Write a protein that binds this DNA or RNA. Structure first.
Length: 155
RNA sequence: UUAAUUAUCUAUUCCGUACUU
RNA sequence: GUACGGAAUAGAUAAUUAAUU
């Protein structure tokens, strides 16, 4: 167990999780709760812009990012401080089609065990070339495999 | 006609963390 | 019962790129 909790102690004990999930764990000790408000949601489906605000007791702060996840993450990170007071897949497809080859293909060969810390290994396939990559999602794994493949097919 | 990328929402499944009964 | 977080599947919306017609 433990005693006399503090916001300085979480940074040494579990800084690996989001400040969103971590800031509410601190809220329970002080009786406060981090309320989340979306300040902004606009832009094209290629480079949009998001804003979050978090409120903990008599204080509130904001954060921003290219996604809903990145904007909420930065805002919780700012509250904690005051409480302490190109596409490789598309580039490869454009080459593979220009070289006269058949369209690229992707297949998973491996996966991690824990679902909360999932990982993937994916193979890229071209008319003569084959390469492998990995990532925290099947979409990220093919992106990594495409990045290594761009070095193989290109000369 | 085909392939690839990105953001948001809803539903389902799995997993992790905190609080509470 | 509540809040936050990741992965997979399905549906809806939107923008972008390449090849072909």
């Amino acid at each position: 167990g433990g005693s006399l909790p503090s916001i300085e102690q979480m940074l040494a004990a579990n800084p690996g999780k989001t400040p969103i999930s971590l800031l509410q764990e601190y809220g329970t000790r002080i009786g406060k709760t981090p309320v989340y408000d979306l300040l902004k949601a606009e832009g094209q489906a290629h480079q949009p812009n998001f804003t979050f605000r978090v409120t903990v007791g008599d204080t509130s702060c904001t954060g921003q990012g290219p996604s809903k996840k990145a904007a909420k993450h930065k805002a919780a990170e700012v509250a904690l401080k005051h409480l302490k007071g190109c596409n490789p897949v598309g580039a490869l497809q454009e080459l593979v089609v220009q070289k006269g080859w058949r369209l690229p293909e992707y297949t998973v060969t491996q996966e991690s065990g824990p679902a909360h810390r999932k990982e993937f290994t994916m193979t890229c396939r071209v008319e003569r070339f084959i390469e492998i990559g990995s990532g925290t999602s099947k979409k990220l794994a093919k992106r990594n495999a495409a990045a290594k493949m761009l070095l193989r097919v290109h000369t």
